[PDB]
Each structure stands twice: as C-alpha cells, then as structure tokens.
C-alpha cells in the first residue's frame, strides 16, 4: 500500500513549541493510521475500491490521531498511489487477469 500526504503549517508557535521534529511525528502517525485502516477491510475491497474508502478513512484517522498532539499542522489532502499486491505474487495476479482474455 502506497499513499502520499500533503500538509501545511499553521500557528507557528505550536509548530515550534509542541513536538520535537513535527515532520517525523506526522510521518509515524500517518504510518500508524494507515496500518489501522488497511487491516479493517478485506483484500479484494482494498484492491478494487481502494481509491476512495481507504484513502478517505485514512484521512479521518490521521486527523483524529494528530489532534491530541496539537502540532498546529493542517492536513490538506491524502491521495492514492497504488494498492499493488506483493512482488512475490504479482505473476499470479496478472496471469489471473490475462486468463479472462485467454478465455475470450
């Protein structure tokens, strides 16, 4: 699973005097929230409709997680890159994709 998160800085007092290195803290919070959201849904739902639900839920979880820290960072948008299966089983997946074309 790959995602990109874009954020901006508001209230510089909080950005400078709340958390040590807020960028790394936001990175770890994003990773934890993405871990929490991906494990809720099954594999095929992630593979097919991953562009909207997973990306949308991730945003809600990230806001909820970084709210207590009060970093002052405002979360603009999180978007989607890829929900590719692992490299070891890619051949099985694309072969299964090509199977329907072979049948036709």
């Amino acid at each position: 699973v790959e995602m990109n998160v874009q954020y901006r800085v508001t209230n510089p007092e909080k950005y400078l005097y709340s958390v040590t290195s807020p960028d790394d803290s936001l990175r770890q919070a994003t990773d934890s929230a993405l871990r929490g959201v991906i494990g809720k849904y099954t594999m095929d739902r992630i593979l097919t409709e991953g562009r909207t639900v997973i990306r949308s839920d991730t945003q809600r979880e990230l806001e909820e997680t970084i709210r207590p820290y009060d970093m002052g960072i405002t979360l603009l948008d999180v978007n989607f890159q890829a929900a590719r299966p692992p490299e070891e089983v890619k051949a099985a997946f694309d072969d299964a994709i090509a199977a329907r074309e072979n049948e036709q």
């Binding site: 070891e88 089983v89 099985a92 072969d95 299964a96 199977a99 072979n102 049948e103 036709q104």
Partner: protein, 56 residues
C-alpha cells in the same frame, strides 16, 4: 505468499477451463453440421451411381 499465489492460479485455471469448454461445444456442433452436409451429398452421389449402374 504461496497460498495467495495458489488461489490466484486456481481462479485463472477456472476461467481458462470455462473458455475451453465453450470452444469445445462450438467445435462439436460445427463438426456435426459438417458431417450432416457430407452425408447428404454422399446420399445424392449414391443415387446417381445407382442410376448409372442400372442404365449400364
């Protein structure tokens, strides 16, 4: 990883088998039609041969 790869191979094999079944059915009905046409032509040819043999 092995388990998921096996499942995906299962799905692919099922799809290919369904396609092969459809192709086999179509080829079978085609062969039946070909045989029927050839049999009709052979019957007409036999009638002509019998006519010639009787005339001779």
């Amino acid at each position: 990883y092995n388990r998921m790869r096996a499942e995906r191979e299962a799905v692919a094999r099922r799809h290919r088998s369904q396609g092969q079944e459809e192709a086999e059915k179509l080829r079978a009905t085609a062969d039946y039609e070909v045989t029927r046409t050839l049999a009709e032509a052979e019957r007409q040819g036999r009638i002509m041969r019998g006519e010639g043999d009787a005339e001779a």
